[PDB]
Design a binder for these strands. Structure first.
Ligand SMILES: [Mg+2]
Ligand SMILES: [Mg+2]
Ligand SMILES: [Mg+2]
Ligand SMILES: [Zn+2]
Ligand SMILES: [Zn+2]
Ligand SMILES: [Zn+2]
Length: 143
RNA sequence: GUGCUCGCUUCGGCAGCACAUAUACUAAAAUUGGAACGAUACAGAGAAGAUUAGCAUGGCCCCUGCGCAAGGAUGACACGCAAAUUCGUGAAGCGUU
């Protein structure tokens, strides 16, 4: 039934008020894992996973840095138990990197020419209104 | 998108600045051709009588094997009027100069 947790210590103080929605985000991830690929291209079928992973991480990020509604103990519990991404949070604290979808979309080893994805280009600098879905992510303009 | 703006200046909008700077064999396709060693009919082991161990040779024939081992019927093929340059003696008969 649970997330089966790997601490065996009781979860920290503010846990019971963020638990319905974390379990609701977790239910949404288990739906996306089982969606049968039919008219969903070979790269398009992994787009829900990066989106919900972004969503869970942004949820804990919004409660600890913006709303300030979680202590260090509860926050680091959620990172250890796999509800947030420590590395994606770490990029959102950088200056320009603040709606970043994926860690793939800034990885320069993953591209042909050693560069980011066009996901990361500012939308003013494309100048035309071309519509873009990043192949890694499905993103339409982080930046 | 975020933040700083002793920016207009409200907490609404806009202005400037800074940071952030180019994914993808681009398909969820449309097409396009070639193969298998299975049946189904005909077919039956090389060495000058017969029964036969084999080891090679050669390459527009390959198979099993990691193999520069070893096997595959000695793995198979090989069975061919197998003619390559280059001529002359002697006698006789007929016609001709
Ligand atoms: Mg042999
Ligand atoms: Mg024999
Ligand atoms: Mg042989
Ligand atoms: Zn991207
Ligand atoms: Zn992404
Ligand atoms: Zn993106």
């Amino acid at each position: 039934m649970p997330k089966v947790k790997r601490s065996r210590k009781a979860p920290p103080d503010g846990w019971e008020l963020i638990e319905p929605t974390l379990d609701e985000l977790d239910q949404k991830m288990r739906e996306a894992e089982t969606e049968p690929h039919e008219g969903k291209r070979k790269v398009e079928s992994l787009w829900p996973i990066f989106r919900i992973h972004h969503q869970k991480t942004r949820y804990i990020f919004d409660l600890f840095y913006k709303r300030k509604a979680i202590s260090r103990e509860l926050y680091e519990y959620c990172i250890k138990e796999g509800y947030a991404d420590k590395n994606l949070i770490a990029k959102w604290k950088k200056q320009g990197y603040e709606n970043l979808c994926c860690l793939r979309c800034i990885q320069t080893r993953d591209t042909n020419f050693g560069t980011n994805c066009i996901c990361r280009v500012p939308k003013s600098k494309l100048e035309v209104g071309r519509i873009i879905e990043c192949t890694h992510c499905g993103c339409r303009g982080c930046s």
